[PDB]
């Protein structure tokens, strides 16, 4: 009753895909992601010290940041076509 | 070892009271954590960087030991007792002139030490190069070789370039003698070749008997 | 505690106590020497130090001795023949809040 019989009724799925963080944590009734806190503007304060190691900055692709490290290393010379045009004048 | 949410499961579960790793579904789950006897546990009394790495020694007592380690180099029974092959060497203390600075190339410097009877000493050190016998060879200490000739010089006879590459030759300025050169391995009697500039400065750094040192303030 | 000893005054009860180790101390010294050399090379003829006055130390423990002050008063710079704003352009430090107290400290700094 309390255990094995009651697990047959667990066919609802409350936490669905979050559109911000992509974890299966967006609640349907609550309309809030339990992981990242969407749709609050700021990110939810992560519930563990390891949660930054899993989900924080640097754990993803860092598509813009890897470009701006490379430009900062070279001195922010920017677009190579426009670099020669500013140098001629 | 402390990166878990581990708790003791308590008594009553026929298992020891050590903290168990929380969660399920992995092999790490329910295993012991946090303890020094646990696998992947924190070692009890972890090592800290606030350990006192350096040791203080009184400066006057360190200066006496530098003086006594210097006197050990002047005793030919001590120098051959610590492994230096000093049969060919003229005197001990062997003092070379301040025209040592006119040697420009180390081929002429190796020839100069050869005609001082140090050829067997340098060859003993060069062939003694072997791989260290422990895990120190992993930690950037792969090769050990013996300690050979120490050359003490001063700033007016600077022979650093022409001599530093000869295997078995260490160079030390006379203004700063460490005991790591004078008794390497806590074994007195390092084979030391002096320049004339460094030798004549010894009565200035340490003074004479009963007198203060001129170059070292307040040393007797 | 057990025996005869001085009563313990060890203040490590706070778990928030930090430790400042000094492993950078030989390295900071070589950085400090390098910056001083680069300052001297940036101001090649000009001395790296300001000219600072000789002041007497404050309390009764220390008024037997003099030390090197912060800057000269503008009335000291005027008696020496200088405008204090001109005096800063040459390597003289100027202190606007020190009071010209007596003739002995005044005439020593003017000289």
């Amino acid at each position: 009753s309390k255990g094995t019989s009651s697990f047959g009724k667990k066919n609802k799925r409350n936490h669905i895909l979050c559109v911000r963080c992509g974890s299966m944590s967006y609640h349907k009734q609550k309309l809030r992601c339990s992981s990242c806190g969407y749709p609050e503007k700021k990110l939810r304060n992560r519930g563990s010290p390891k949660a930054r190691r899993r989900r924080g900055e640097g754990t993803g692709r860092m598509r813009h940041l890897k470009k701006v490290r490379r430009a900062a290393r070279n001195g922010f010379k920017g677009n190579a076509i426009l670099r020669a045009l500013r140098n001629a004048n | 070892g402390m990166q878990h949410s581990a708790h003791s499961w308590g008594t009553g579960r026929a298992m020891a009271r050590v903290p168990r790793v929380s969660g399920s579904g992995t092999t790490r789950s329910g295993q012991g954590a946090f303890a020094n006897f646990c696998r992947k546990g924190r070692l009890a009394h972890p090592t800290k960087v606030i350990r006192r790495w350096q040791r203080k020694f009184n400066l006057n007592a360190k200066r006496h030991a530098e003086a006594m380690a210097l006197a050990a180099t002047a005793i030919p029974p001590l120098v051959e007792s610590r492994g230096h092959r000093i049969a060919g060497v003229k005197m001990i203390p062997l003092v070379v002139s301040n025209s040592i600075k006119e040697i420009k190339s180390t081929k002429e410097a190796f020839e100069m030490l050869k005609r001082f009877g140090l050829a067997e000493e340098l060859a003993r050190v060069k062939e003694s190069k072997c791989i260290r016998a422990g895990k120190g060879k992993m930690r950037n200490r792969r090769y050990v070789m013996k300690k050979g000739l120490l050359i003490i010089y001063d700033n007016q006879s600077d022979i650093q370039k022409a001599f530093r590459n000869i295997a078995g030759v260490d160079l030390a300025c006379v203004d700063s003698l460490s005991l790591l050169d004078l008794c390497p391995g806590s074994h007195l009697g390092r084979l030391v070749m002096w320049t004339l500039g460094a030798f004549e400065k010894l009565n200035e750094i340490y003074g004479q008997y009963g007198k203060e040192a001129p170059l070292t303030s307040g040393y007797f | 505690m057990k025996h005869n000893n001085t009563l313990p005054n060890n203040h490590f009860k706070k778990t928030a106590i930090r430790f400042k180790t000094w492993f950078n101390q030989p390295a900071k010294k070589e950085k400090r020497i390098q910056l001083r050399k680069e300052k001297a090379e940036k101001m090649y003829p000009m001395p790296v130090e300001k000219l600072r006055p000789i002041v007497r130390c404050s309390s009764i423990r220390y008024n037997i001795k003099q030390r090197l002050g912060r800057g000269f008063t503008p009335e000291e710079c005027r008696a020496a023949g200088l405008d204090y704003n001109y005096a800063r352009t040459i390597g003289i430090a100027v202190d606007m809040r020190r009071k010209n107290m007596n003739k002995e400290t005044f005439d020593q700094n003017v000289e």
Binding site: - | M138, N140, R142, R164, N165 | -
Partner: protein, 138 residues
């Protein structure tokens, strides 16, 4: 001694630099000494080995053989010389991989712009020897 603090004497970093060298560096690490007849002409000690280089083997089983380089493989660092071979079971002859340090170049290939690259190292060696001659002159 190495007095440059910015370069490693570390074994771990030197070993990682050898096995994760990129292809430009792996070409340089696969250099081979020249003969004395090549060193009187070119002057430099060694040069990176290439296909169609004549080579005498200096160490190993094939020591003393001469042959052309037929294959260089930068990953696993192996030069395959013509007439340094071993058969498989099915009679197929396989070239045996020799390290470039065990090969000495007898005749340098000069076809695909390599004569430019040899002369660039030769001239920079000649120019740098002129500067060191003037500095020791002064």
């Amino acid at each position: 001694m190495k007095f440059n603090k910015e370069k490693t004497a570390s074994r771990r970093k030197n070993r990682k630099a050898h096995f994760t060298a990129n292809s430009t560096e792996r070409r340089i690490r696969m250099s081979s000494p020249l003969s004395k007849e090549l060193r009187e002409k070119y002057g430099f000690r060694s040069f990176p080995i290439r296909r169609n280089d004549k080579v005498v083997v200096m160490k190993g089983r094939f020591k003393g053989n001469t042959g052309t380089v037929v294959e260089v493989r930068r990953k696993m660092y192996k030069v395959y010389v013509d007439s340094c071979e071993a058969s498989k079971m099915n009679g197929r002859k396989v070239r045996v991989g020799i390290d470039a340090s065990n090969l000495k170049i007898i005749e340098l290939y000069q076809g695909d712009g390599r004569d430019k690259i040899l002369e660039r190292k030769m001239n920079n060696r000649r120019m740098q020897m002129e500067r060191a001659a003037k500095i020791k002159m002064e």
